[PDB]
Amino acid sequence: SQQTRVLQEKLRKLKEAMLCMVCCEEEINSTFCPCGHTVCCESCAAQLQSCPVCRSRVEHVQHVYLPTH
Amino acid sequence: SQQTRVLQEKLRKLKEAMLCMVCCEEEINSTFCPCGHTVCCESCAAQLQSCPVCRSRVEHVQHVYLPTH
Ligand SMILES: [Zn+2]
Ligand SMILES: [Zn+2]
Ligand SMILES: [Zn+2]
Ligand SMILES: [Zn+2]
């Protein structure tokens, strides 16, 4: 129905919010510490020395195990 | 249709996976370090001394800013 189409779009938007903001291909699973922005996959996070959201120094990357994975 | 019901269930489960595993009311926004389990809100994470998923000693709680918040 039309409601199936509406729900597919909502699901797509929620899944896109869970994808890395740099590569757009892999799920977010890494936090830039200490700022806390959790916006990248592990491969993109390993290549950034400054946060892409707030520009703070990345002291280290913490892997996050999320229930939505 | 039955497809609409399947998608509604997927959306519900994804939304439930973003809620704190202790209070079931507030969004997850905290990571237990060093293990990385990210399953609680700030208030519930604050006094836990051991991770509720893996039993590891909690050395630090890192706040996380997720795009799904
Ligand atoms: Zn990436
Ligand atoms: Zn940041
Ligand atoms: Zn809680
Ligand atoms: Zn743990």
CATH of the domain at A28: 3.30.40.10
Instruction: Decide if B14 contacts B22 (C-beta within 8 A).
Output: no
Residue B50 domain-assigned (yes or no): yes
Nearest residue, CB atoms, B63 vs list A7, A36, A53: A36
Contacts A31 to B, Cβ<8 Å: 31, 62, 64
Instruction: Work out how many domains chain B is built from and give that number.
Output: 1
Residue B57 domain-assigned (yes or no): yes
Residue B68 domain-assigned (yes or no): no
Put simply, the answer to whether A38 touches B66 (Cβ < 8 Å) is yes
Residue A22 domain-assigned (yes or no): yes
Residue A36 domain-assigned (yes or no): yes
What is the C-alpha separation between B8 and A18, in angstroms, rounded?
18
Question: What approach was used to elucidate this structure?
Answer: X-ray
Residue B50, domain extent: 2-63
Query: What SS3 class is residue B63?
Result: strand
Residue B14 domain-assigned (yes or no): yes
Burial label, B62 (beta-carbon count in 10 A; 0-12, 13-18, 19+)? buried
Instruction: Decide if B58 contacts B32 (C-beta within 8 A).
Output: yes
Q: Is B61 an 8 Å CB contact of chain A?
A: no
Resolution in A: 1.4
Closest CA relative to residue A37, chosen from B41, B42, B63, B14: B63
Closest CA relative to residue A65, chosen from B17, B15, B7, B59: B17
Residue A40 CA, chain-centre distance (Å), reads 4
Question: CA triplet A14, B51, A28: central angle to 5 degrees?
Answer: 25
Put simply, the answer to whether A62 touches B7 (Cβ < 8 Å) is no
Please give, rounded to a whole number of angstroms, the shortest distance from the CA of A26 to a CA of chain B: 14
Residue B45 domain-assigned (yes or no): yes
Residue A44 domain-assigned (yes or no): yes
Q: Is B45 an 8 Å CB contact of chain A?
A: no
Please give, rounded to a whole number of angstroms, the shortest distance from the CA of A57 to a CA of chain B: 16
Helix (H) or strand (E) holding B30: strand B30-33
Helix (H) or strand (E) holding A30: strand A30-33
